[PDB]
Amino acid sequence: MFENITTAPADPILGLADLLRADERPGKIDLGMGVYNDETGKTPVLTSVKKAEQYLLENETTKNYLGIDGIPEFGRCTQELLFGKGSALINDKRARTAQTPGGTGALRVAADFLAKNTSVKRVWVSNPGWPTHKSVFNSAGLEVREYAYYDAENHTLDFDALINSLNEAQAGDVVLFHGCCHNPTGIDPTLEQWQTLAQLSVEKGWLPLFDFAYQGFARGLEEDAEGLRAFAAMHKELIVASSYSKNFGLYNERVGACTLVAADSETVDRAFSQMKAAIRVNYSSPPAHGASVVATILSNDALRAIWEQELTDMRQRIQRMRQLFVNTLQEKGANRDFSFIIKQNGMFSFSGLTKEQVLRLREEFGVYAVASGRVNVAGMTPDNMAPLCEAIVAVL
Amino acid sequence: MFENITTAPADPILGLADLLRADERPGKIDLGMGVYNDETGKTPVLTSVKKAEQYLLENETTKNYLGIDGIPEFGRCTQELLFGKGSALINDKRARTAQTPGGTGALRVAADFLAKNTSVKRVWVSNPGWPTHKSVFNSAGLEVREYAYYDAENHTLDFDALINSLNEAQAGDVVLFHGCCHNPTGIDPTLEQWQTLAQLSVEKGWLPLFDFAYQGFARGLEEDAEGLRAFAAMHKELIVASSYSKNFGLYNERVGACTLVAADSETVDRAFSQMKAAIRVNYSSPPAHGASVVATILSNDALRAIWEQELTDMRQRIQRMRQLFVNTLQEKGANRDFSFIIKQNGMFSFSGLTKEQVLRLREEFGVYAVASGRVNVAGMTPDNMAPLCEAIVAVL
Numbered sequence A, B: 001m002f003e004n005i006t007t008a009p010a011d012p013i014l015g016l017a018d019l020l021r022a023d024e025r026p027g028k029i030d031l032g033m034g035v036y037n038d039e040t041g042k043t044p045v046l047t048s049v050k051k052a053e054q055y056l057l058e059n060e061t062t063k064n065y066l067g068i069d070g071i072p073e074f075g076r077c078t079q080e081l082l083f084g085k086g087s088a089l090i091n092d093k094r095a096r097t098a099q100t101p102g103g104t105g106a107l108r109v110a111a112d113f114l115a116k117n118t119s120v121k122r123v124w125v126s127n128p129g130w131p132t133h134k135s136v137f138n139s140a141g142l143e144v145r146e147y148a149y150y151d152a153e154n155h156t157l158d159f160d161a162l163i164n165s166l167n168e169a170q171a172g173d174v175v176l177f178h179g180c181c182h183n184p185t186g187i188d189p190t191l192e193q194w195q196t197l198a199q200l201s202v203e204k205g206w207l208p209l210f211d212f213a214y215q216g217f218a219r220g221l222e223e224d225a226e227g228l229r230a231f232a233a234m235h236k237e238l239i240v241a242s243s244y245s246k247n248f249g250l251y252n253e254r255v256g257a258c259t260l261v262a263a264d265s266e267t268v269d270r271a272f273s274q275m276k277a278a279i280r281v282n283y284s285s286p287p288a289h290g291a292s293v294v295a296t297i298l299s300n301d302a303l304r305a306i307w308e309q310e311l312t313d314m315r316q317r318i319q320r321m322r323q324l325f326v327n328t329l330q331e332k333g334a335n336r337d338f339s340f341i342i343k344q345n346g347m348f349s350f351s352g353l354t355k356e357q358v359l360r361l362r363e364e365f366g367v368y369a370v371a372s373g374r375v376n377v378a379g380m381t382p383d384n385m386a387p388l389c390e391a392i393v394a395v396l
C-alpha cells in the first residue's frame, strides 16, 4: 500500500531545522525559525514558568482528562488578555474559548469548524505572509486568496493596495489579519488604519479571523491588542487564534487558544458546541501542562509581575539587537540603507535579500535564514553580530 | 454566519462528564469514562510520574520546539515496548514513530495520512466497538464498516462470525484491531486466534491498524503485545496507534504515538515524510511534557521498576473489584449469573444491561454508565460496591 507514496516537499520554515542538524561545520548561525534567544544564544525557560511548574509539581493531585475545551481559568484569562479586563464581550458572555495545542492547532480547529459548519469557501491571507496559513486552510478544503500588503520599494504598508486588493473579497469570505508583529514584514497597521479596516469589514460582511502569536512583542500587552479590540467593538462575529509559544517561551508545550465570538450567548454556545465536535475527532482534549502553567502565572499577582517583566526584557533585547544590526551593517560597508529595519516590530526583519542571496549565505557562510529574506533578529547576539553582518555584506 | 449552526449531538462517552457535573445530588457513582480510580475513588498521579516530573523540573533548560515527530527517545522506547527489545522490525529500521497528542490524536493522524496518500476507502471496526473510531475515520472522509465480534448469548468472542464478517473485506481495506482489552467487551482473541487472523490478513491483503491503549492491563506488558507481534512477523506493512493515557495515568497530558511499518527503511521513511506533512498542518509539533515523562521513566532502570509495579497494582486492584462485584451482586439477590464478568480483562465490564436499564440507573439511582451497558470496573471501590450493586439489582 505504501510502495508508491511520494516524498513530501520540505517546509520552507520547519525544514530549516533539518538542514541545520545536517550541517556539521561550526559557527553556524540560526536566524530562521522564530524562537527567542538570550544574549548567550540559548532559549531558556522563563523564571516565572519554572516557578509555576514548581507550584504544579507540589499541588497537582491528578492527570484526569480535561474537558474538550480545556482549563476554564485558562479561557477566562485568555479572553481578558485579548479584549480587556471589563470588556463587553465578556460581560455579555459573547465569547467562547477552547484551549488548543499551540496557535497552529487553533488555526486547524478554526479551519475544520468553518469548513463543515458554515458557507465559507474562501480565506484571504496577506502576501507576503506566513506559509503555514495557506497549508492549514487548504488541508481543510478551503481555498486561499492573497491580498497585497507590503510596499517593498518604500518598506512600508501599502494601505492603498491592501484596500483595493480586498475589494475582490465577497461577503461571507474570511479575512485573516495578524494581530501585531506581522509575520514576516513586522509592519502593522496604525490604530487609525485598523479602525478603517474594522469599518470596511462590517460594511462588506467579511468574517474576521485574527492570528495572535506575538501579543506583547510590539509595544505591550494592552497596546498590541488595540487593533483586535477595534474590530471587536464593531463586529458581532469573529474568530481569534492565539498562541503562548513566544510570549511565555512555552514553544514545545503547545499552548494556544481558539476564541469564538457571536452576536449573543445562545448563538456562541450553539456554534461552540460544533467547535468542540471538531476537536473531539482530532485530539479529543488538550495537553494540560503548558496551559496550566499559563493559568497559574496569569492568575497569581506575584508570578504575573515577574512574567510581565521577563516579556519586557525580551522585547527590549530584540529592539537593541535590531539597532546593533543596522549599525554593524553600515559599519562594515553595507551596500545600502537598512534603517527601515528599525521600524519593524516583532522578532523578525524582512531584509530584502533575494532567494539566491539567502541560499549563498547558507552554503558558504553557514548562516540560515528563510528563503523569503526573513531573518530572526531575536536570534542575534553580541557574539554573532560581526560574522553575521560580514556574510551579508559579502552577498550584497 | 453562525446564526444557523445546529447544536452538536452529545458524545455517548465524553458527554457523560457534562451530565455528572450537572447532577447535584450526592452519592453519584461514575462508572462511565475509562479512568483508573484507587481504593479511595480518586485518580492519583503515579509516584514514578511525580519523580520524573521532579527530574524534568531540575534538568530541563529550554522549551524550544520539538521536531514534528517528537522526542526521538520516546519513539525508540515505544517501538521496543510494542515489538520487543531485539525485534527485527527495529533492527531493519522498518518502523517510524511520531509522538502524538494521545491515542486519539494518533488515530486522527493515521486517518489523515491514509485518506490523502493511499487508495484506502474503507476501514473495518468491530461491533460492539468504540464509537470514537467511527467518528474519527468518518471525519477524514473514510467510510467505516463493521464486523461481528461478540456472542452476547454466551458472553464470548464469536470467532466464526468474525471471520465470516470479514470475508466481505477486500484487499487494500484497513482492518482495525484492539491490541488487548477490547473496548468494551474485554474479550480478546487467544494467541492461536491472533495467528489465524494474521495469516488470513496477509492472504487477503488487508492493512492492519492496531489501536493499543491498554498495554499492561490484561496480563502484562510483553504478553499483551503477543497479538500485535504475531501480525508484525507476517506483515510487511502495518500501523499502530498507541496511548500512554491509562498505563501511565497521564490522561490529560495527551501522550500517544502513531507507528508506521513498511517493507524496508527507504519505503517507511518516504511514507513517514507524508505522515509528518499531515501533522504539520494540524498541530505542527507535539506537547513535550507528557512524552518527556514517559521517556524519562522507561529509560531509567530505577523509575521503570517503580512504574511497572504501579501498573501491576492497578491491574490487580481492578481484578479484585471484578470479583467483589460478582459476589456482591449475587449476595444481594442478583437476578442472573454474572460470572462471565470475571473472564473479561481491562477496565471495563460489558454487563448486558439495556439502554433503558442504564437510563434508569442514572435518573433514579445516580449511577452513571455508558448506554451500551459498559461499566468501568476501575471506578468501583469497596465503599461504593454495595449501593452500586443494589441499584443494578433493582433494575434487573
Ligand SMILES: *Cc1c(COP(=O)(O)O)cnc(C)c1O
Pocket: A034, A101, A102, A103, A104, A105, A130, A178, A183, A211, A213, A243, A244, A245, A251, A255, A256, B283, B284
Ligand atoms: C508562531 C506563529 C503561530 C503559532 O505558533 P504555535 O507554535 O503553533 O503556537 C501562528 N501564526 C504566526 C504568524 C506565527 O508566527
Ligand SMILES: *Cc1c(COP(=O)(O)O)cnc(C)c1O
Pocket: A283, A284, B034, B101, B102, B103, B104, B105, B130, B178, B183, B211, B213, B243, B244, B245, B251, B255, B256
Ligand atoms: C482510551 C482509548 C484510546 C486513546 O485515548 P487517549 O485518551 O486519546 O490517549 C484509544 N482507543 C481506545 C479503544 C481507548 O479506549
